[PDB]
Amino acid sequence: PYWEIFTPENAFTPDDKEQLSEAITSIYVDYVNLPRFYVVVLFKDMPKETMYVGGKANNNFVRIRLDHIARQMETAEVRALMMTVAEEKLAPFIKERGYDWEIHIAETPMDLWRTQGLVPPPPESDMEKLWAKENRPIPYDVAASKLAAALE
Amino acid sequence: PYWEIFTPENAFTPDDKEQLSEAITSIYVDYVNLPRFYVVVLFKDMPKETMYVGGKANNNFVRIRLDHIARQMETAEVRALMMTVAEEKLAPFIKERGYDWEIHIAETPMDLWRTQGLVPPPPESDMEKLWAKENRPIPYDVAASKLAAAL
Amino acid sequence: PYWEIFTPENAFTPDDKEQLSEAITSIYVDYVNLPRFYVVVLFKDMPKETMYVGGKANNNFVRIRLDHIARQMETAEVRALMMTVAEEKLAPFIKERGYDWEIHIAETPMDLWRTQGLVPPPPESDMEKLWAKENRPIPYDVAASKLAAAL
User: Fold this and answer.
1) Helix A14-32 / helix A76-90 crossing angle, nearest 10 deg
2) Cross-chain CB nearest to B40 (options A53, A95, A105)
3) Among chain B residues, CA nearest to C5
4) Which of A46, A110, A134, C112 would staple B105 via disulfide (CB 3.0–4.6 Å)?
């Protein structure tokens, strides 16, 4: 997953960013045992008078946008749950500190994606589980792993 | 709508940004009666030698990218009209100030979107009109709103 | 094509950026005959403690994202080729300099895109070839060009 979090300048401490990115990472670990390092969160500090909401500068506004690449969400229930859990993780850092905020997700093609130059392994495959356990992208025989994964 | 406008450093004053983001907001207020606060415009100053066009730095280039989330544009005519009006609103600040520029839109799924943690109301619904009038996201019974709006 | 390259601060010099964006541009020129100026690369310096990978800051990490607008890649083989060649162009600047890195592509609708306020010509069309030769967006009659292209 690819997350962008646009904040008022200096809204979050380094410890805040660690804690919040950990919470966001836990979504994908807990619900789909994704390798932790798949989860990328980019914090973007926005200076005053750079975020305009409804045509007026808003310096108390956090805008979040994310791509999902590894998995598709194929039912209304699963899609609603993703939004529900995302807001649950964000609330201690954003809602509960009095910020205004908005979030949206896009789904992008799984096959147009490389990490450390490698083809990520198939969902729920042994190699994906290995990548998760090691928490690093391990070079592997893509065809061999795909073949065995298809016969699971 | 989620707009990113990448500009040369110090291209726009705060007054500029207010007026341009106001012009952009007016597109959605006027044409589709969207709540103003849905329209988010992020101005991103780009230092010299950070925007490369055709392999060469262009320090006089404004790049615009937007996501449309709330509605889909379903006909060629409506889609063309959006591009035309966007260019109209941008021209006084960008084209007419001598910049080179480029713009594109992506459309993203309506059901993967929350404002203030809330599910936004149906297009053209009473709750959406209420959200526009109050210009804030009002907690409401989503199913009750969807029900009455359908009827 | 619209590339974003998020890097640690001061990772790349302007000459690095020229060379790398030239390599990226060459992909589209060589394989698709696209006008050079379609290829936009935005370099974004990211301070320490702003890129978090698996819940921990990675201050040695380059993240690349691109939109493809002017072409759709319709077969598995072409799509794999795109990724392979992208990595080949990136390697001297990123992999071989010891960075960790990740890249992905989205495809966005071709009709919601303007450059210099103009409708870009159709893929492989004569007007596209003219735009490529001149390396600038040339105003043209959209209907007149489409009329001749049909014959």
Assistant:
1) 160
2) A53
3) B50
4) C112
Suggest the residue from C114, C135, C138, C142 to mutate for an interface test with chain B (most B CBs closer than 10 A): C114
Sign of the dihedral through C-alpha A18, A23, A28, A30: positive
CA B48, CA B25: separation in Å to the nearest integer? 29
Burial of C29 (0-12, 13-18, 19+ CB in 10 A): middle
Q: Which chains touch B (3 or more CB pairs under 8 A)?
A: A, C
Contact: B6, C111; criterion CB under 8 Å? no
CA dist list (Å): A91 to A23, A24, B121: 11, 11, 21
**β-sheet with A100-107: strand ranges across:** B113-115, A100-107, A61-68, A2-8, A40-46, C51-53, C56-57
Between chains, do C79 and A41 touch, taking CB under 8 Å as contact? Answer: no
Phi, psi dihedral angles at A107 (to 5 degrees): -110, 130
Resolution in A: 1.5
CA distance B50 to chain C (A): 5
Per the structure, how many domains does chain A have? Answer: 1
Q: Which amino acid, one-letter code, is at B117?
A: G
Cβ of C135 within 8 Å of Cβ of B54? The answer is: yes
Provide the residue range defining the domain that includes A151.
1-152
Q: What is the CATH number of the domain that holds A139?
A: 3.30.429.10
The helix/strand/coil state of B53 is strand
**A96 near A89, Cβ under 8 Å?**
no
CB spacing of B108 vs A106 below 8 angstroms: yes
User: How do strand C100-107 and strand C61-68 relate by DSSP bridges?
Assistant: parallel
Q: Which two tokens stand for residue A7?
A: 């904040």
CB contact under 8 A, A63 and B69: no
How far apart CA A7 and CA A4 sit, in angstroms, is: 10
Q: Across the interface, do A42 and C6 touch by the CB < 8 Å criterion? A: yes
Contacts of B52 in chain C (CB under 8 A): 17-18, 21, 40-43
Residues of A in contact with C77 (CB under 8 A): none
Elucidated via: X-ray
- The CA angle B117-C102-A125, to the nearest 5 degrees, is 85
CA–CA separation, B51 and B65 (whole Å): 14
